[PDB]
Amino acid sequence: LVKNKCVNFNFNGLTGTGVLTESNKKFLPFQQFGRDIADTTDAVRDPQTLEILDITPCSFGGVSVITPGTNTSNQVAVLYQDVNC
Amino acid sequence: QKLIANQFNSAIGKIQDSLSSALGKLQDVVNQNAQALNTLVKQLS
């Protein structure tokens, strides 16, 4: 198991892509993975060590270019629209 | 002037009680936009 970086994963056949992290969720002993209000997986129980993991996506939206206008200058700034640098 | 000021000061107190006891026009815009999004997500399956 590797955590805090984007990976493909498969736990016991439950398959996906995302950043796995340690979790505060408390599954009952028979429950094996968790879902949100939109019915998509967001948590999983590790089959080896029975600890709870969160899942989070890897797809992060716009890149936007900020310009003085080319009449004024050719230098620019760039916005990564939802990213922690 | 004193009567008119008292009526005004009294009337503001009623607004505060009414709001602390609705905003349906705003709330149902938020609800409509959440419904459209959850419906978009449901269409994937």
């Binding site: 939206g61 | 705003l26 997500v41």
Partner: peptide
């Protein structure tokens, strides 16, 4: 502000308003 009251997987995103609530 008290009285009035996540799908990131699917390419859905929410953009901040230009003005913040403190500006309004």
């Amino acid at each position: 502000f008290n009285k009035v009251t996540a799908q990131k997987f699917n390419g859905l995103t929410v953009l901040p308003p230009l003005l913040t609530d403190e500006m309004i």
